[PDB]
Structure formats: structure tokens, C-alpha cells
Ligand binder design. Structure first.
Ligand code: CHL
Ligand code: CHL
Ligand code: CLA
Ligand code: CLA
Ligand code: CLA
Ligand code: CLA
Ligand code: CLA
Ligand code: CLA
Ligand SMILES: CC1=C[C@H](O)CC(C)(C)[C@H]1/C=C/C(C)=C/C=C/C(C)=C/C=C/C=C(C)/C=C/C=C(C)/C=C/C1=C(C)C[C@H](O)CC1(C)C
Ligand SMILES: CC1=C[C@H](O)CC(C)(C)[C@H]1/C=C/C(C)=C/C=C/C(C)=C/C=C/C=C(C)/C=C/C=C(C)/C=C/C1=C(C)C[C@H](O)CC1(C)C
Lengths: 93, 233, 159, 219, 219
């Protein structure tokens, strides 16, 4: 029917799905637009990650212009990997 | 949970120990089906026989008798160079949590103050520390190569006896896997220790402190900023 | 296209369960095999003390932080720990009377493992085994809550 | 007391692990069975290692006695200048060349390049004739010749000769380790090793090693 | 880890000279084969030495704990007068007899000759009944009785009991050597041994032993 036993490999690990995921999304994620004044969406909150890593135990402020960077960065990072994994065209496309 | 059906010798697991392993190069793997001396059957074989320093079967064994010991030392070496640089940055006095003068603290005020607490071991002698190290370690590694109490010496790579409290050491396919998680994590510990050592030579700050400095400015605070140091002239 | 992940249980589409990477994934399966409630070869007393040590130590917390004695210093820990020990006591009583009600009659007929072989029945599921498990739970839980107080009093940057 | 046999004084004694590697079981001096890495599994390479270790041991023993004698001689009743083995190599540059015994009636070597060239010529000759033989009878044995290098004749009785072999090898190992100690003392404290001896005999525990332990501190 | 057998932890371990004297090969606790003079060759005299060493070991262990406890107790939270074991024997003479625990509600022994006579009577009784047996069952074993002296019942399992024998003998040897140390400290420095402990822990190397090395100088 569907199957008779659960296959113990279901995520077929193709090793260059993740490296192309974040490597092929972050090398164009740090270009530099007019929009930020010459900064990236990977270096402008590198400043932030290190910045509130300085004063360590203080959890950063709940309105601090970098939660936006965290959320909008992962909103694309996860998407590019989840569309990379459907780059298993081994039998479909 | 299903009993991994063994019945045979191979140990495939996912894909780890057979002819089709996972090699090192993604298309330029070892020529002619990987040099003829090593075709699976053991944890940690990936195929770097490029210098070929081990072609005799006894040397293939004796180098691995080094490997597992070396890796296990590096695991505790890594964690034992990580822990108090975190703890001192949180809330705990130590003297100096940096792993250069961690050994020099005996000379400082009164010996070794443990966890910043003046109610503990307080080792004032270096000489007694030397004595206990030599004596107890020479005993223990004599027992490693011979086999004495608390379990006899059967396999010098993996004894697997009353030493293990969990008693996991029964199903052999899951440990065809876990003998390899060992070596993967141990080589991670090896190169983390080279991080400790070469960062120790070049800049002389703690490895945690190197991570903090790097993440404060990843493009500026990295190895290349030390590149003009150590130049003759 | 000739690829499927979700399967019925051990073939057999007519038992009301179906297998998923939530239930029958390998790491999840080995994890829930290694928990103390599924080991079947150990004496139930020891399981009782392991489970009790875990649950008491976790149960102590919320009474400490959120109990009615949480702002008065240095005694907010005492009332919490004492109340948690009380809760563990009541859990021990519940285990005892469950033993008095459940295993009070005949057991079932047969049991096999998933990769079929005839495994024997777990000795936790008899009256004696369950009562011993309850005693182990009481000992472990009280030891755990006492350890929670101990751990509060001597701990580097507790707050 | 049975080095030539299975009952040799093994590398751990009664922690011996009497399952010794089978490619050496007695029959050669110095076989103490301590092969943890096993870099001498091949037999011809093992022979090379026996020859190489013998050469290293004899050279190191010569160097070790050369590191003990001149300092004591200049400390007792003679003068050399810098009897400590550091600037004994630079005694040719200082003022009047290298005067032997600290006496301007002996070698008095002015130019070091002449020592250099003659030393290369003589050393090449002696090492070539060491490998392939030559004078005083052609070399038939690479390990121990038995020709006219023993003018006293101590190599008649075989078992005492084998005991002499084992003593030679043990002395050579000790000499190599001790010269390593000399080199490490040259690095760390950079003073006289027999000055070290006198200072440690005068100061047994107050200046032991770890006053000289914060010198090569990186920063 | 095989004291009961040929593979015991011998007197030099790795320099064991496995040609041990044949009149002891395991089968008794404490047999470490260190017979350099050999004053126990005869077997009945050897048995006498086993009994004698057991008696000495138990007495010395009792004395050693008696030398560690009272000073620490009077240092922590109590007072005895002279808790150091020198004048604890003269605490009966000083002012009010020997008050136990430093408390005038306990033994308060005024006359030492009464302690003397009662001590002789009791010690003669217990030593005679120790040799030939008597109360609590007649003594059938001179070394270890097995009768009602072990009210806990630890002597059921034999190999753990033998390990207890070996631990007892090793503890006794350590106690005898340590009490010799106590006596030598009583002679040379004549101060408190635990005062010695505190002073050496406060002064690890400046007052070690050889400040107290020019005291008994003849002239
Ligand atoms: C059973 C206790 C025992 C202990 C603790 C040692 C100690 C050691 N011996 Mg050994 N030995 C012991 C038994 C014996 N040794 C010897 C005679 C020798 C010799 C001739 C040599 C050793 C060497 C060694 C070293 C081998 C590992 C190493 O290279 O060091 C690495 C570890 C460190 C350097 C940590 C030091 C801090 C090690 C330091 C070798 C050595 O000294 O190399 C350095 C060596 O050449 N031993 C004999 C008489 C046959 C023994 C019988 O008991
Ligand atoms: C009162 C009657 C009395 C009787 C009849 C016995 C009878 C006996 N006792 Mg017992 N004892 C008695 C009272 C006491 N004993 C002991 C303590 C012991 C011990 C510890 C031992 C005996 C033993 C023996 C037996 C043989 C000992 C012997 O030959 O002595 C001859 C010995 C002497 C006259 C004195 C020897 C002194 C010794 C050489 C000390 C040397 C000191 C050191 C060199 C170091 C000194 C200072 C430091 C700082 C250097 C024998 C059955 C021994 C035994 O049963 O062996 C199997 C045995 O080991 N007795 C004490 C505690 C003080 C007693 C108190 O009243
Ligand atoms: C290394 C892990 C770690 C640790 C030990 C702490 C520890 C702490 N955090 Mg923190 N935190 C973490 C990760 C961590 N956090 C992460 C990943 C985030 C999301 C980016 C936060 C966000 C966060 C906030 C928003 C706050 C804390 C706060 C706190 C403190 C309570 C305590 C010191 C609180 C605090 O004291 O900050 C003022 C607080 O308000 N944390
Ligand atoms: C002391 C540690 C040690 C030892 C004894 C060995 C021994 C061995 N390894 Mg192994 N290995 C090590 C560390 C070590 N390795 C580390 C850290 C890694 C991760 C990189 C690996 C990864 C690895 C793989 C993936 C494979 C082996 C293999 C082998 C076997 C044959 C290869 C050979 O001749 O190398 C002999 C090795 C030595 C003689 C050690 C040389 C040490 C000197 C000082 C040179 C190293 C200096 C370094 C290269 C300079 C840069 C340092 C920088 C990279 C940090 C042999 C059993 C093959 C095998 O059979 O699998 C087990 C194989 O497929 N190894
Ligand atoms: C993460 C690294 C790692 C892993 C995966 C293993 C895995 C294994 N080891 Mg192993 N080992 C390690 C590190 C590791 N070891 C280190 C560092 C040492 C030196 C101290 C040893 C010393 C050792 C010995 C002497 C023996 C094994 C054995 C085993 C096997 C059975 C035990 C088992 O399943 O434990 C599962 C392991 C874990 C669940 C990891 C626990 C991690 C802890 C909880 C972290 C905190 C610990 C910290 C120090 C406190 C298994 C293949 C036995 C064997 O193969 O015999 C058949 C055996 O005899 N190991
Ligand atoms: C008439 C019935 C009755 C009575 C007498 C009580 C009495 C109490 N309730 Mg309560 N309650 C009741 C019905 C009742 N409840 C019902 C029906 C509900 C559900 C609606 C609740 C829900 C409720 C909540 C949600 C809470 C209470 C709490 C309390 C305590 C408040 C006293 C105080 O200020 O904290 C002082 C508290 C202490 C000093 C701790 C004492 C802990 C026990 C009594 C001692 C146990 C001794 C020890 C474990 C024995 C050792 C065993 C050995 C094996 C080691 C008090 C014991 C509070 C409480 O205790 O929780 C923290 C609380 O938060 N009640
Ligand atoms: C370069 C000098 C040298 C060489 C070639 C040898 C050669 C040999 N030794 Mg040997 N040995 C030496 C010095 C040397 N020894 C010294 C100085 C000591 C005293 C510490 C010993 C103590 C010793 C024992 C106890 C035993 C041997 C044995 C052997 C034989 C087998 C081991 C082997 O393959 O070694 C190959 C050696 C090398 C390839 C040399 C590598 C050198 C590099 C630079 C690494 C050295 C780094 C070092 C570990 C760091 C600390 C140095 C410090 C200890 C001095 C072989 C003939 C065994 C045997 O059967 O005897 C016949 C045996 O049981 N040796
Ligand atoms: C008077 C106490 C005493 C006695 C009777 C014995 C008796 C014995 N011991 Mg023994 N031993 C003792 C104290 C004693 N021990 C102490 C204190 C130590 C620790 C240093 C040891 C350590 C020891 C070892 C390691 C071994 C023995 C062994 C033996 C047995 C054979 C040796 C023999 O014939 O001894 C006869 C002894 C005497 C006749 C005592 C003579 C005493 C006079 C006063 C001379 C002492 C002077 C002394 C050397 C000076 C320094 C004293 C200082 C070291 C304390 C025998 C049963 C061997 C054996 O097989 O065990 C069963 C063995 O291997 N003993
Ligand atoms: C065995 C083994 C095994 C395992 O398996 C592994 C391992 C461990 C690796 C191995 C080991 C090895 C080793 C240790 C080695 C070492 C060596 C040495 C030390 C050498 C020396 C060596 C040394 C030597 C020769 C020396 C020589 C010397 C000389 C000439 C001298 C000269 C001099 C003199 C006269 C004086 C003057 O004024 C100056 C001088 C100039 C100073
Ligand atoms: C073996 C051998 C061998 C070889 O061959 C030879 C030789 C070497 C000779 C030998 C040896 C020998 C020896 C060494 C011996 C020793 C011994 C001892 C030490 C004893 C002690 C012994 C000791 C002892 C008993 C002791 C006892 C003690 C006591 C009772 C005490 C008491 C007391 C107390 C409580 C406290 C108080 O307040 C006071 C007093 C009074 C103080």
C-alpha cells in the first residue's frame, strides 16, 4: 500500500543541499543597496550580534532594530534551504 | 523501534561501512576503489593513504591504538579548556581562568583556590602533584596495556566491561555507528585543540576571548590581522 | 513518484495506528527505548528511584518561584520545598492505590516485539512489581526534593 | 638478568604484558620490547635502526663525556676561558684563536675555515671508510667489525661480550637522553650545566625548575 | 591485584626478582615476600610472627587513632587541658585528677595507683583469655577466632573476608610506621604532631626538617 515498514532513511541526505543553501543565499545576501546606507543584510547585524554579545548576560532590548534582522534573515534562509531540498529531482521533475 | 537486522558482517547503518562509504572528495575519491589495504570493516577509515605511512597490517593496528587514545585525550582537553572561561564570564571567581596561567596559580597567593572558594583542596605543593600524577597514571596505563582489576584487559581499543555503568554495549550494529561517532567527535576535538594551541602561540588570549573578539568584528578581528607578526626583519 | 515515507504499523493496515517520522523515526525510537520506563530487564524498585529523583527535582521549582512565599527572603525556598515534598507524598499514595485497583485480576495473554520475536511480559505489570515501583518512587521523589533544597543553598549564581 | 631470551627485563617489568611483538624476541642487545608506535616493523629497516641507534649512541656518549670533562677541569686547576660548552665554539673568534687547554703553546687555531675544510675532508674519509670498510682490514661487519679496533682483545669470551653490548646500548640510551637534557638546559636557562649542578646542590628546592617556568610566556 | 597467589604485588613490583623464597607463596594476607635477613625461616616461628604482627598491628592502629582524635577534638570545639599526647598521661597529677573530656562530670580519676592495679588485673585477665580462650566461646583459633567478636556478620563471603584481612594487615603496617614517626617527632622536636601538621601546612618548605637537625649535636 503506502509501505510495509518505515524506511529509516527518509531525509535523503544530499551533502550539497545545505552548503548550497546558506552559501548560495548569503553570498548574495551581503551586496549593499541604497536602502541601508551602504550596508548588507548580513554585515549590518553582524554588528548587532557582536554588539549585544559584548554585554553578555543582558538579554537585548525588546525594541532594538535587530530582531527585524534576525527574523527577515531566517525567513529567507529557511526558505532557500527548503526549496533546495526539493532539488531532489531524482525522479520527479 | 525495530531490531536492526544484523545476521551478516557488513555494518551499513545508513551508508557508512561497505564498498560504498562516504569518502573525502565528492568526486575525486581514492583511485581504483580505494587503496587495497583498507576497505571498511572498522570505524574511522575514510581514505587519506596519500603519504602511505602505515602499509603493514601491524602498523594499521598500532596507529589506531594511538588514534583512539589520542582522540579521547583531546575530548577532555577541549572541554577542560572551555569550561571556566564561560564560568568566570558568568559569575565565578577563579584567579585566572585563562589556560596559560591556570597552572601558575599555585605560585600566586596560597596555592590553588578552587572555584574561588577557600574551603577546598588547596594544593600548595607542586612536588606532591608530580608524584601522584606519575604514580597513579603509570599504574593506570600499565593496567591499560596489561589488564588488572575492575575488569581484565581483553581489547585494548575498547574494553567494554563493568567499567560501563549504562550497559549499552550489547547490540553491535548501533555500535558500528557509535564507534564512529567516537572518532568523528574526537577529530573535532583534535582540531579544536589545534585552535587552542596555534591561537595560544600567535595572540596569547583565551580561545573564548578569541571568539568574543572575532564576533565583535568578523572582518577585522581574525587571523589575517596577525599575519604581519612573526616576520623576519 | 515511487517514494513514500508514511507507512502502516508493521504492514498490517488494520490496526488503528500508522507509522510516521514522529513515532518511528530511528533517533526517536532509540531515545524512547533508553528511557527507564521501557527497559523491562531491571528491577522495578530501581526504576522507581530514578523516576522519583527526576520528578521531585523538577517539581520543587514552581513552588519556589511562584508560591505565596516567594518575596520574603531566605524562607521562600523552605516553603516551596516542603510543599513539593507534600505533592510527592500524594503521588506515592496514588501509585499505591492504583496498584491495588489495576493488577487486581488476571493479566493479558501474549506479547511480541515489533521485529517479531516472542518477548516475555514486563515484571512491572504485576502487583508486587508495581508496589515495589511505588516504594521506589517515594524514596526517589523525597530524595529529589531534598536535593533541590540542597542545590539551592550551594550553587554559584543561583537567583 | 636474562636479556638474551624471553625473560628479559621488559619495558614495564611486572606490568610486562607477556604478549610481546614477535618481530623481536631477544638475540640482540637492548631489545626491551617498547614498541608503542611500531616504526621498525620491517626487518631491514629494523637493521638500519640498530645500526643508526648504535651510531647515535656512540656519538652521544662521546658528546656527553665532552660536556662533563672540560668544565670540571677548568673548575679544578686549569683555565680555558669559557669552559662552558656554549662559547667553546666561539673561542676561535674572541682574541687569539682557539688555544687548547687555555695555553698559548698548543693548537692555537686562528682560521675556522681551515678547520672547516680539513674537518669535511677527514669526516668524509672516515665515514665513507666506515660504511664500506677500508684501512685496517676491509669492513665485513657494519654493526661490530671485530677487526683491529680492539687492540686489547676483550671480544674472546662471547657472553661477557654480549653483556658489553647491552651495557654499550644502555649507556648510549642514557647518553642520548642526558644530552637532550643538556640541550633543554641550553635553551631554557642558558647557563652552565655543571653550574646548574652546583647551583641545585647548593639550592635543592628553592630554585628547582619553576622559577625558570615563566620565561617563554607569549603575550 | 592478586595477593593470594604467585602474582601478588611483590616488594619491588617491577623489580620483583621472581625467584621468591619458597617458604611463603601467597595463601596468607600481607605476604609481600620482603625477606632480606630471613628471621622467619622456621614455620612455627613464622606462625608466631603472623600472630605477633597481627597483635602489634591492631595495637598500633588503636594507638594511632588515639593519637589523631583528641587533639583534633580539643582544637575544634572542646577543651581537654593538654590534648597533646605527652602530658595526657600526666593529667592525673596536675590539679584535679584526669577529668575525661575536660569535664568535671566524668571519670575524674584521682589516684593513678588504683588505675594501675585495676589495669593490671583487667589486662592480665583479657590477655590470658586472649591466649587460651574463655568467655564468649572457648578460643579455637589464635589468629582470627570467628566466634562472637563479629556481631555484624561480615565474615560470610570468603574472598571479601580475605581482602579485609589484607586491608587489616596493610593498615597495621602503616599504623606501626606512622606511630614510629610519632615517637621520632616526640623525640626530636617534642611538640604536637598535629601542631606539626598545622605548622608544616603553614610552612611547607621554610621549616621542613633540617632546622631541627642541629639539636642533638655532641661536643
Ligand atoms: C610501571 C611503572 C612505570 C612508569 C610510570 C614508567 C614511566 C615511563 N617509562 Mg619506564 N615506567 C614504568 C616501568 C618501567 N620502566 C622501565 C625502564 C624504562 C626505559 C629504558 C624507558 C622507560 C620509558 C618510560 C616512559 C614510557 C612512556 C613515555 O614515553 O612517556 C611519555 C609521558 C611523559 C613524558 C609524561 C611525563 C610527565 C614512561 C615515562 C622510556 C622513556 O623514558 O621515554 C621518555 C624509556 O626509554 N622506562 C623499567 C625497567 C625495565 C620499568 C619497570 O618497572
Ligand atoms: C599485664 C600483663 C600482660 C601480660 C601477661 C601480657 C602478655 C603478653 N603480651 Mg601483652 N601482656 C600484658 C599487658 C599488656 N600487653 C600490651 C601490649 C601488647 C602488644 C602490643 C603485644 C603483646 C604481646 C604479648 C605476648 C608476648 C609479648 C612479649 O614477649 O613481651 C616482651 C616485650 C617487652 C618487655 C617490651 C617490648 C618493647 C618494644 C621493644 C618497644 C620498642 C619501641 C620502638 C623501638 C620505638 C620506641 C620509640 C620510637 C619513637 C622510636 C604475651 C602473651 C605481643 C603478642 O601477643 O604477639 C603475638 C604483642 O604484639 N602485648 C599492653 C599495652 C601496653 C599491656 C598493658 O597492660
Ligand atoms: C547562552 C544562552 C543564554 C543564556 C545563558 C541566557 C541567559 C539569560 N537571558 Mg537570554 N537569550 C538567549 C540566550 C541565553 N540567555 C537567546 C538566544 C535570546 C534570543 C536572542 C535571548 C533573549 C533574552 C531576552 C530578551 C532576555 C534574556 C534574559 C536573560 C537573563 C534572564 C539570563 C542572564 C533577560 C534579561 O535579563 O535581559 C534583560 C531578558 O529580558 N535573554
Ligand atoms: C596522532 C594521531 C593520529 C594517528 C596515529 C593516525 C593514524 C592513522 N590515520 Mg588518522 N587522523 C588523525 C590523527 C591521527 N591518525 C586526525 C587528527 C584526523 C582528522 C584529520 C585523521 C583522519 C584520518 C582519516 C580520515 C583516515 C585516517 C587514517 C589513518 C591511518 C593511515 C593514515 C596514516 O598513515 O597516517 C599516519 C599518521 C601519522 C603518522 C601522524 C602524523 C603526525 C605528524 C606530526 C604529522 C601531522 C602534522 C600535520 C599534518 C601538520 C598540519 C597540522 C594541522 C592540519 C592541524 C592511520 C591508522 C586512514 C585510516 O585508516 O582510517 C583510520 C583514514 O582513512 N586518519
Ligand atoms: C562523544 C564521544 C563519545 C562517544 C560517542 C562514545 C561512544 C562509546 N564509547 Mg566512549 N569514550 C569517550 C567518548 C565517547 N565514547 C571518551 C572521551 C572517553 C575517555 C574518557 C571514552 C572511553 C571509553 C571506554 C573506556 C569505553 C568506551 C566505550 C564506548 C562504547 C559504548 C559506550 C556507549 O554507548 O556510551 C554512549 C556514550 C554517550 C551517551 C556519551 C556520553 C557523554 C557524556 C554524558 C557527556 C558528559 C560527560 C562529562 C565528562 C561529565 C560507545 C561506542 C566502551 C566500548 O566501546 O566497549 C565496547 C568502552 O569500553 N569509551
Ligand atoms: C480545607 C482545605 C484546605 C486547606 C486546609 C488548605 C491549606 C492550604 N493550602 Mg489549599 N487548596 C484547597 C483546600 C485546602 N487548602 C483546595 C480545595 C484547593 C483547590 C482549589 C487548594 C489549592 C491551593 C493552592 C493552589 C495553594 C494552596 C496552598 C495552601 C497552603 C497555604 C498556606 C500558606 O500560606 O502557605 C504556606 C505553605 C507551606 C508552609 C507549605 C506546607 C506544605 C505541607 C502542608 C507540609 C508537608 C510536610 C512534609 C511534606 C511531610 C514530609 C514527608 C516525609 C516523607 C518527608 C495551606 C497549607 C498553597 C500551597 O501550599 O502551595 C504552595 C497554594 O499555593 N491551596
Ligand atoms: C633517534 C634516536 C633513536 C632511534 C633511532 C632509536 C631506535 C630504536 N629504539 Mg630507542 N631510544 C632512544 C633513541 C632512539 N632509539 C632514546 C633517547 C631512548 C631513551 C629515552 C630510547 C629508549 C628506547 C627503549 C626503551 C626501547 C627503544 C627501542 C628502539 C627500537 C624500536 C623503536 C623504533 O622504531 O624507534 C624509532 C625511532 C625513531 C624513528 C626516532 C624518532 C625521533 C623523533 C624526533 C621523535 C622523538 C620525539 C620525542 C618522543 C620527544 C621527547 C624526546 C625526549 C624523550 C628525548 C629502535 C631500534 C625498543 C627496542 O626494541 O630496542 C631495540 C625499546 O624497547 N628505545
Ligand atoms: C616488630 C614489628 C614487626 C614484626 C614482628 C614483623 C614481622 C614480619 N614482617 Mg613486617 N613490617 C613492620 C613491622 C613488623 N613486621 C613494619 C613497621 C613495616 C613497615 C615498615 C613492615 C613491613 C613489612 C614488609 C613489606 C614485609 C614484612 C614481612 C614480615 C614477615 C617476615 C619478616 C620477618 O621475619 O620479620 C621479623 C621482624 C622482627 C624480628 C622485628 C625486629 C625489629 C627490630 C627492633 C629491628 C627494627 C629496626 C628498624 C629496621 C629500624 C627502622 C625502624 C623504622 C623502619 C620503623 C614477618 C611476619 C614480609 C612478609 O612476608 O610479610 C608477611 C614482607 O614482605 N614486613
Ligand atoms: C624509541 C621510540 C619509540 C616510540 O614508538 C616512538 C618514539 C618515542 C618517537 C621513539 C623515540 C625516539 C627518541 C626519544 C629519540 C631520541 C633521540 C635522542 C635524544 C638522540 C640524541 C642524540 C644526541 C647526539 C647524537 C649528540 C651528539 C653530541 C655531540 C656530537 C656533541 C658535541 C659537542 C661536544 C662534544 C662538546 C662541545 O663543547 C659542543 C658540542 C657540539 C655539544
Ligand atoms: C620486617 C623486617 C624484615 C627485615 O628482614 C629485618 C627488619 C628490617 C629488622 C624487619 C623490620 C622490623 C620493623 C621495621 C619493625 C618495626 C615495628 C614497629 C614500627 C612497631 C610499632 C609498634 C607500635 C605500637 C604497637 C604502638 C602502640 C601504641 C599505643 C598502645 C599507644 C598508646 C597511646 C595512646 C593511645 C595515646 C595516648 O595519649 C598515649 C599513648 C601511650 C601513646
Amino acid at each position: 500500500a503506502s509501505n510495509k515498514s518505515f524506511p529509516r532513511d527518509w531525509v535523503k541526505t544530499d551533502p550539497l543541499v545545505p552548503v548550497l543553501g546558506f552559501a548560495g543565499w548569503t553570498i548574495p545576501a551581503n551586496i549593499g543597496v541604497s536602502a541601508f546606507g551602504g550596508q548588507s543584510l548580513f554585515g549590518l547585524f553582524t554588528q548587532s550580534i557582536g554588539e549585544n554579545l559584548a554585554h553578555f548576560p543582558t538579554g537585548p532590548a525588546l525594541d532594538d532594530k535587530f530582531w527585524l534582522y534576525l527574523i527577515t534573515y531566517h525567513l529567507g534562509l529557511f526558505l532557500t534551504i527548503t526549496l533546495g531540498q526539493i532539488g531532489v529531482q531524482g525522479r520527479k521533475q | 523501534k525495530k531490531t536492526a537486522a544484523k545476521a551478516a558482517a557488513p555494518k551499513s547503518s545508513g551508508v557508512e561501512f561497505y564498498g560504498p562509504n562516504r569518502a573525502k572528495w565528492l568526486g575525486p575519491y581514492s583511485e581504483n576503489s580505494t587503496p587495497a589495504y583498507l576497505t571498511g570493516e572498522f570505524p574511522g577509515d575514510y581514505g587519506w593513504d596519500t603519504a602511505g605511512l602505515s602499509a603493514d597490517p601491524e602498523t594499521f593496528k598500532r596507529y589506531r591504538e594511538l588514534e583512539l587514545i589520542h582522540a579521547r585525550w583531546a575530548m577532555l582537553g577541549a572541554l577542560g579548556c572551555l569550561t571556566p572561561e564561560l564560568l568566570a564570564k558568568n559569575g565565578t571567581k577563579f584567579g585566572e581562568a585563562v589556560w596559560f596561567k591556570a597552572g601558575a596559580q599555585i605560585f600566586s597567593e596560597g596555592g590553588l583556590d578552587y572555584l574561588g572558594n577557600p574551603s577546598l583542596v588547596h594544593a600548595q605543593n607542586i612536588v606532591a602533584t608530580l608524584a601522584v600524577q606519575v604514580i597513579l597514571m603509570g599504574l593506570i596505563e600499565g593496567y591499560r596495556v596489561n589488564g588488572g582489576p575492575a575488569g581484565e584487559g581483553l581489547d585494548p581499543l575498547y574494553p567494554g566491561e563493568s567499567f560501563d555503568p549504562l550497559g549499552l554495549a550489547d547490540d553491535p550494529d548501533t555500535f558500528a555507528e557509535l564507534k564512529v561517532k567516537e572518532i568523528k567527535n574526537g577529530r573535532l576535538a583534535m582540531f579544536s585543540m589545534f585552535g587552542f594551541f596555534v591561537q595560544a602561540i600567535v595572540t596569547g588570549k583565551g580561545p573564548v576571548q578569541n571568539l568574543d573578539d572575532h564576533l565583535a568584528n568578523p572582518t577585522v578581528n581574525n587571523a589575517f590581522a596577525f599575519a604581519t607578526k612573526f616576520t623576519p626583519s | 513518484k515511487k517514494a513514500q515515507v508514511i507507512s502502516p504499523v508493521n504492514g498490517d493496515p488494520f490496526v488503528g495506528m500508522l507509522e510516521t517520522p514522529v513515532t518511528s523515526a530511528p533517533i526517536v525510537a532509540t531515545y524512547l527505548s533508553n528511557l527507564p520506563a521501557y527497559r523491562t530487564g531491571v528491577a522495578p524498585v530501581l526504576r522507581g528511584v530514578e523516576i522519583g529523583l527526576a520528578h521531585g527535582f523538577l517539581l520543587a521549582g514552581p513552588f519556589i518561584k511562584l508560591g505565596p512565599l516567594r518575596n520574603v527572603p531566605e524562607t521562600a525556598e523552605i516553603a516551596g520545598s516542603l510543599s513539593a515534598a507534600g505533592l510527592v507524598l500524594i503521588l506515592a499514595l496514588c501509585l499505591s492505590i492504583y496498584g491495588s485497583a489495576q493488577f487486581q485480576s488476571t493479566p493479558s495473554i501474549g506479547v511480541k516485539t515489533l521485529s517479531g520475536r516472542s518477548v516475555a511480559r514486563d515484571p512491572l505489570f504485576s502487583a508486587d512489581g508495581w508496589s515495589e515501583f511505588a516504594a521506589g518512587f517515594l524514596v526517589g521523589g523525597e530524595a529529589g526534593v531534598a536535593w533541590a533544597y540542597v542545590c539551592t543553598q550551594i550553587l554559584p549564581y543561583y537567583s
